[PDB]
């Protein structure tokens, strides 16, 4: 069988999110990177705790090793999308997006639900 | 931290935030196989007769020609945080053994 | 007698918005049910479930498994979780989990149902 | 090196337009080749004859055999016969048929490629 | 007339008018069961480059989940009142051998 | 298998032709009578080969069994649709459709091809 | 005040014969007798466009609804008989809404 | 009873066609929708008469004049005949009180 | 204002070019008042069997409430620089009488 | 009445030409202006023969003292017009207008028949 | 100039309001006239005080002079839009609207905001 | 046959007044005398909208250009007053047909 | 013609009532000369942040080219039967001295 | 070089932005787009001011005057502050030369 | 750096002539003086076209935009007459935007 | 001809900070430093907001688009510090496009 | 002006010198952007088989990333100012929407 | 079933398109090694001679294939191929160097 052949190979993506990759040592900001099927980077996703949003703590310079490496990102926009709590993730978070195509190509690309 | 970590019973659960809190979630095992697409579905919403129509239309298209093995309805257990309960409608990939072994619970 | 009767007497029971079912009456009351259009083509699966029995946390595992086998490869293309009852023939609040085996559309189209 | 360029190493080859394609050699010239999109799902079954040989009425009998049989159960969406010929690595006139599994918008979204 | 009639070889043959002359045309064996589906294509349109797209949708899909077992394309053979050269493009639902059976020819 | 079963028992139905019914005793012009998947009369078909209309031939009261057994019909359009030649029909012939419903529904119930 | 109703003269064979000219010159055509009663409705078509196998889709909708026909007792396709000033043949695709004979009869054909 | 029949009937696409018996041929013909509103002024023409040179002048008055109000929306010239009860090629000049849209919905004809 | 040249049997013709042939064209007396409306038809048209459908719309809708007198349908007379012969429908606003003084038309 | 005694009181407007105006001096180029029933004015149009084109005539320096009178024109397009011959044209001409507002607002404002 | 010439011996038309007159001795409850750019009537508007209507005050036979100055009115659509109170309207009024060509008609002839 | 016009009640100073349900409260009703002659036009009007400043636009549309009315006699703009099962006031905005001493005759009141 | 009383400071005011309360409203001198823009604004709107876009499209378009003198924004003053208070931002197209005098305002 | 580059920025949804600072705080203010065309002309405001009931007459006469010609479009009324630079609320009275999708279009801002 | 601004051949009479090639043959073509100034926009219209009744409706809507003209000095209607490998006759329509004499001046004609 | 490039004052830690009023509170704010660099684009997101669970999609496109970024440093998420007038907490979500040394110098803070 | 004018459906225009004539010239918008590379050729060229390898290298390898949309190839010619027939093949670096809008052209 | 990649050309490697793109496509050609050397737009000359003017070619095929940078462009007649009768140019966007492309591609340098 092909089809399951090349699924076996193919790395996973999830609909919504894409294929994503973060640097361990960068945790729990990151930012994550994800990836459409062709393998084009699509986003860039820093995550902070609400919690500490809420004790005013104060995050500096962050994302810089991984940004470097990126090199050219060209932005189109930024999202701020909630999340959290659920099976996985133990407090409420916000996922801040660094977008590099347009909001439709996003969805598009990623197979997202629209917004 | 944000990202989901392997958890015994339900494998690591991957989502798109902006289509919390239903999803639905897709739970993959350790190998990375994908085991079973889940909807996290409050049972409040369900107390209020709300009517759920065309819900994981692009994750389940993802699938592409699949066998849908099983499935299960589920509370929700425990979760740090956690404070409304839901059911996990679950949609299972492989034999309910298999799911119990790979998701180790 | 005309040929249209003829023809509507042949042609199993399909009722608009629900399709032509079927059970095995051995997965009763859970199902699942299969409804299939007027061509008998497979449009959805569909489980009941009390809304009684959520709230009191029934744990239901491996569902449908016989019915599911039975079946065969085929592509899901959305799920709808509708709720129903109480009325004549349900005595307490129900919700149809529904695996779609074709888009939104097609199903009301192929079921004759009224729009979502 | 990026972690880009590492998944685009890993991912299978894919042509805008024709998807990832595969066929049996035993099979050649005609075939069928499968064509498939980036996420692995096969999305349809092209069929290459020489036009020269339709207008001496060569006869094509149960062509596709194996590799349709080892496929599975399906829907089969729409047909398309396209022209291809000649060019470099063609050197006459032939005619791609297409066993399409999905719409034609689908199939045009999925393999990337232009609106026909 | 203008209805079908069983023909040796290719069974009995029904189409929609409007959709001459490739069709698709549905083939049926005397038992009136669908042997398959075959669109009639004037060999002209084909020395023509003519770009055939998505075309006989609604007859496959009206096979809904079904089984191809292979393809033939034949060369219209001598048929009453027809003078151009057509190709029958054949997907068939049966084995080889069982259409020859069945359509008697 | 129930799919298979119900297939079996259902009356073939050719798409954008309908499921035909002729009483072999008014042919060769028939009208042969299309039904819809519901087994509702869709339209009521004449044939006539196009040699005979060129010969000047004068068809008269032609169909008025069938009529007479139909009874309430309420014609909504009518359709002139040329058939023929090819393998069945050895001449050029119009289909005389008198249709019960809009161009639309038939087009949608017969699930044909759109005009 | 000094009016009249419109009527066409019968036409044996055709009775009074209406028609919206923008329609022309398939129609349909509409007959009624003497009395007034809807005889026929005639779609005419021209020979030539039968024989270049022209395809007439939804013709007379408008007509055909507007008239609520209920019942067709026969149809009738003839070739165009001579008719003053008509030089090319047609065909006349008659929906008659009564027997043949009483057709003959109120038609004075 | 005097319940009045000779009346005309209501043609899909003509409406209730009405005309002056000593106008004719030309008329016009006034055409009315089934509430009894006059939706067009007809009048018609030969077209031998036209190849002729022939002068149509002063025509309709004493019809237009016991129309008085009209506020005119549009014209159309439509050409007819032969066919059988007609046997000379023809032009209908309407002269019409409604848009063209309205004008075939309240005469119930086909779409243009 | 910058009237064009008055013509005998048509007064004072404005029309709006992009709508030639048939126009139509708005026939004003020497005072300025409309007295007719004049679709100019190319009788080839006519002899092909044209069908001149919704035309006017924009000139008679414009020209609102009023009342159309009596109506003219006369071939095309000497005109300098017209070539085909054209048939003028004219839905005139006055009596012929006073129709032939204010164009001063023979 | 009141409305009858108002466009006894207004400007000749006619549909498709509006008001024009021209300085006779300038006949028979012009150009000529057209102004809505506001009184805005809409295009400046130049009156040219076929002919003369045909016989590449020369025209230089049109227009200015007319245009030098008018000051801010704020041009949106240009239309070549075809005109003639009619009563009142005997001869082919070209109406080139040099228009003030969109193509749409200019069909609007002069009450004419779209292009 | 002409533009500005053209405009001064032109009457006042307003935005939203039209040509406005009103035979004086109807006031204050008119109706008042609302003609457009062409001097086409547009609509006939009935001025009354929201505590008039509160006070249960009875107009009957209001406007019959104009009324039967002005002959065939054929009535589209009717307003009831709210007024004042603001300078020049020292308390609540209602416009009572009687319309004589289509609502999109209005506020495009009378060159107003939309509703 | 059997069926006879449906026709309701008649109310003095309002006549046989009928109004498509569906358009309720505003209307507009339609007020006919005995002889079955259309004496105007009401649209129903709630004064506790116009305490509101609701804005009535483009109200009785279809029904006005059914009626074809190009002539108004005269316009009221009268008090309901109160009506058996109305516990709303409402004004009557009256496009009245005919005289207004006509208006008294017919309509009885 | 019709025109409404005039206001000392506002002259002849005009407003579409359908676009109240802003409108904006159209002030005309004794002679008809357009003198000023108006928009009414109430305060409590200002202060609640209340986003004004786009706002006199339809009347300053049909005003067309011409030129704005000056601006004012001055508080509403007292006004029989106006209850809340508003602020009038206005386009004048004549002099401020010239304002003063049309309008006959202190 | 005397290449000039005092200029300011131009600015997503704001434009080249320049004022008479003899006029300040009020301004106007006058944002031109790329090309250099004047897009629209802002009258800054203190809602402190407005609660005060403050009189602001004859504003902005120098700078309108020496624009000439300006066909305005629209007025928009937009409120600012307080945040950073900004210490207390305004609104910005702005006088539009061009539609408000050419303006948003022109001046590179989002929508509205 | 290397790069330096791209500007075609100045035409005498017509100066440094630009046009977006997917515009022609109409254009309307740019021409420009020695120091960068826009002299005036010429549309080059086919004669042919013209014995044809084209109707030219909306032309150089996007340039006219882009260019902002207010003051149009004069127009000139002249012919092309020949250049190099231009074999059809065309005519200029001009919308000068200086005087006629600057134009001659600064266009080298 | 008396006019001057409007900017605002230099703020230590912000630079010349620009915003399009109708963006507001998010913006995103442009930040300058003296020489007239773009130093950060700031996004100013209320607390409020966040507890809510607010959901921030596809802010500051057209300017993203218009300034074409194609290298970010580092990223800051900073509390409200406290400024004159701002009464409620928000966020200043950073996209810094020089390094953490040289913001700090650059827009002297 | 004392650079290059932007001039409506061609952008402001660079080009290396010594390029000449095949270049290729870069288009900017107002913003300075880099719209799209074009390539400029006579059909005469063509129709006498010219090889043309390796163009505008040079240029290419100084500009950097560019991420190419789509491709047009416009005939040019003749016309006041250009004698004969020539082909503008054109690498265009937004979506073809966006190079009429930021080049402000008339729409194709 | 393996990989169904077509025969290695000298000069165009292993050639891919989309046929219903043709003639022009364009033409992906990849080295032994799997990778794309060069995108190939084939414009039959006759095309041009006729003043056709191709816009937004390609663009399904360049956003998929992200290509980044372009090191050179060839127009090239094309070369002999079988079966290959009319005349016609390939447009080249190649990504190596001239050295490489030569090389990978097995073509004559």
């Given at each position: 069988n092909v089809s399951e052949a090349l699924k076996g190979a193919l790395p996973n993506f999830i609909p919504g999110l894409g294929t994503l990759y973060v640097?361990?040592?960068?945790?729990?900001?990151?930012p994550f990177l994800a990836y459409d099927r062709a393998g084009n980077l699509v986003k860039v996703v820093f995550m902070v705790p609400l919690k500490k949003l809420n004790e005013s703590h104060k995050y500096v310079d962050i994302g810089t090793k991984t940004l470097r490496a990126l090199g050219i990102t060209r932005i189109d926009h930024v999202n701020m999308i909630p999340s959290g709590p659920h099976p996985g993730v133990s407090e409420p978070h916000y996922h801040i997006e660094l977008v590099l195509v347009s909001v439709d190509q996003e969805r598009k690309v990623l197979e997202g639900e629209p917004y």
């Open positions: 640097d361990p040592s960068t945790l729990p900001e990151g």
